[PDB]
């Protein structure tokens, strides 16, 4: 049919980034310029592809990952970045081929008490490989000392909470991100454009 971006962009709940969510897009036609010429996007990057001249392309598969992060962390959803997000949460590969679309969602994700439902991994023995997705909750061993399931100095609960309130700084405000990566395979294209 006509690929359902509205299902991913306009969706009610968005994942915490550490458990980011991915919908697979296939066998339809995508009008990328309803999005391009949309507004209320604060970031519309693209890589290895041009942001105009999108409906000129055909692909085997498109993947839309999506999650919430802070303002100051959008620069980390990009090839070659480092930071608690790009390292421990969501890693774009150096050879990325897709688009990074983000917008401010203060007025949806920040309760006045502060919405602590949005989480992000703050510790990890090693970095994420690209598009790898870690959702374990096992206590982080920072020292030489086995933690045996317990919290305390050098023994940390891995996940952390965002302090999402209005009248935070704009870079501490909740942003909703969507990363579209395109796959070209020895298969025939399924997603194209009018």
């Amino acid at each position, epitope marked *: 049919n006509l690929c359902p971006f509205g299902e991913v962009f306009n969706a009610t709940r968005f994942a915490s980034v550490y458990a980011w969510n991915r919908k697979r897009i296939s066998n339809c036609v995508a009008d990328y310029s309803v999005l391009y010429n949309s507004a209320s996007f604060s970031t519309f990057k693209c890589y290895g592809v041009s942001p105009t001249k999108l409906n000129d392309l055909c692909f085997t598969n498109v993947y839309a990952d999506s999650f919430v992060i802070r303002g100051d962390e959008v620069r980390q959803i990009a090839p070659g970045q480092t930071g608690k997000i790009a390292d421990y949460n969501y890693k774009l590969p150096d050879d990325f081929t897709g688009c990074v679309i983000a917008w401010n969602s203060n007025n949806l994700d920040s309760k006045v008490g502060g919405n602590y439902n949005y989480l992000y991994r703050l510790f990890r023995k090693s970095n994420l490989k690209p598009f790898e997705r870690d959702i374990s909750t096992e206590i982080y061993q920072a020292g030489s000392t086995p933690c045996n399931g317990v919290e305390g100095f050098n023994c940390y*609960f891995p*996940l952390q909470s965002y*302090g999402f309130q209005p009248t935070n700084g704009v870079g501490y405000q909740p942003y909703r991100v969507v990363v579209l990566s395109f796959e070209l395979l020895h298969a025939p294209a399924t997603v194209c454009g009018p």
Partner: nanobody
Amino acid sequence: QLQLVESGGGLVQAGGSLRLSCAASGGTFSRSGWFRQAPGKEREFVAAISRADVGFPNYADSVKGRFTISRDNAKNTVYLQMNSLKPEDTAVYYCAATSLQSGKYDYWGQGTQVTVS
């Protein structure tokens, strides 16, 4: 600056059921925990729980089954129901919260004695 104020220990017969409490005045943090320090020994972990999921709770093995941590996001308060107590439980119980920034237990209550006989 965020403050934790605990309320209510005391003396209990072997078998009793105290309830400890903690009010976090005018502040914000991600995880709350209870720790005990016995006389002579080194401070030890009891249980914690975080702001979003009353499905993220951790307990020391020596209290599993018997203690329960409780969160009340309304009143900004954490509770520690203690059941089936034993003299091994005799200690001073500290409440603590992890800073939103460094995810470590940085903010502490002032302890409260619990004695079991």
